Amino acid sequence: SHMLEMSQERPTFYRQELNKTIWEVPERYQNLSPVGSGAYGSVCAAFDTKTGLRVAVKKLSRPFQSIIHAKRTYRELRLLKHMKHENVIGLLDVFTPARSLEEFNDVYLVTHLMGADLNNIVKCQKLTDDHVQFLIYQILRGLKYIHSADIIHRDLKPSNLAVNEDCELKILDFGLARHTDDEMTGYVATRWYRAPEIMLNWMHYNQTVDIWSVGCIMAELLTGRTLFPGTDHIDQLKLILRLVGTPGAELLKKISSESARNYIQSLTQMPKMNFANVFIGANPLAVDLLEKMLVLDSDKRITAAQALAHAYFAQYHDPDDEPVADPYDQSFESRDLLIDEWKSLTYDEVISFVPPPLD
């Protein structure tokens, strides 16, 4: 009760070559195999001899490279420490082999190993309607939680959804610091899921950007193809309007772009398509839910919690089992700091980390 620990031992670490580099981890982790071929960060599967479960370990090897990297590192760590939900990626551990700040460089993060992203799942499976309900249900259950903390994902796409062989899903990698990307081969899966608001910088937008992404993802799960596979920003917009209909005078007045308003008006007008014609052989409740998600007006789009109560998720929905997050204090965002300043704050977050209890 009033007994206190008067000191603490650092775990022993060991070193090894992985992905052509030096991974140096506590002897708590064993059998680290690379996963995902760079696609994620550097992420190795491993065995956590403490919790006795397979884990994933990610190495940030460029976190304090610049003021922009350094703040992003602190951001991602504060977010990941905060997220404590069944459908959101959070942390089993975070460590560094630095014995002090003067030695601090690499940060490693540890979470439960899932074994796939949703892209991989869709690639080897036509998913049944039941698998669609359950996967979409979990996306929405995670987003209800994230949104209740005033956080928005902003990307949300299948490569940001980790899934295991029990069809359990967690949301990874929020949309301001989210691996290495830009444009390397094709267009990759990067623009296809994005809300139009934010694609063309329309308003200050709201959280229902992520619901647009959910609709796009759900559409793909159902049909097996990308809903709006645009070739560039403008094409993507055309493909979107072809389905949802060109926005009306009132919705246009609600946006502050001079460019978008004038662009969209040169475009031949189109009425909303019949969604039962596009989403064939699907549960009609599935279709009705798409109609509430794939709306252009942010103010008229379904919320994460509103969608959870939609008759599509009757088997899974349970208002008592859809937790909300503690308030998340993002004060640090309004600071203009140097490197060795974001770096000490981050070092303070690593060493003050408290692991979840066993069980």
Note whether 151 and 328 are within 8 A (CB).
Answer: yes
Confirm whether residue 249 is marked as ligand binding.
no
Angle in degrees, 0-180, between the axes of helices 209-223 and 129-148, rounded to the nearest 10: 170
H or E stretch at 94: strand 93-95
Confirm whether residue 331 is marked as ligand binding.
no
Collect all residues with Cβ–Cβ distance below 8 Å to 144 and sequence separation of at least 6.
Answer: 304, 305, 308, 322, 324
Distance CA(203)–CA(187), nearest Å, equals 26
CB atoms within 10 A of CB 44: 23
- Reported as half-sphere exposure (CB side, CA atoms, 13 A), residue 147 has a value of 18
For residue 194 the two structure tokens come to: 């994005």
End-to-end CA distance of the chain: 22
Confirm whether residue 33 is marked as ligand binding.
no
Distance CA(294)–CA(216), nearest Å, equals 8
Q: Taking the C-alpha atoms of 54, 35, 26 and 168 in order, what is their torsion angle to the nearest 10 degrees?
A: -30
What are the structural domains of the chain? Answer: 1-115+325-354 (3.30.200.20), 116-324 (1.10.510.10)
Confirm whether residue 298 is marked as ligand binding.
no
Please state, in angstroms and as integers, the Cα–Cα distance from residue 168 to each residue in 88, 121, 132, 171, 337, following that order: 11, 11, 12, 10, 39
Q: Which residues are catalytic, by number?
A: 173
Please state, in angstroms and as integers, the Cα–Cα distance from residue 285 to each residue in 226, 297, 309, following that order: 20, 21, 12
For residue 192 the two structure tokens come to: 């296809």
Confirm whether residue 175 is marked as ligand binding.
no
Question: How far from chain centre, in Å, is Cα 334?
Answer: 23
Q: Say which experimental method was used.
A: NMR
- What backbone phi and psi angles, to 5 degrees, belong to 309? -85, 0
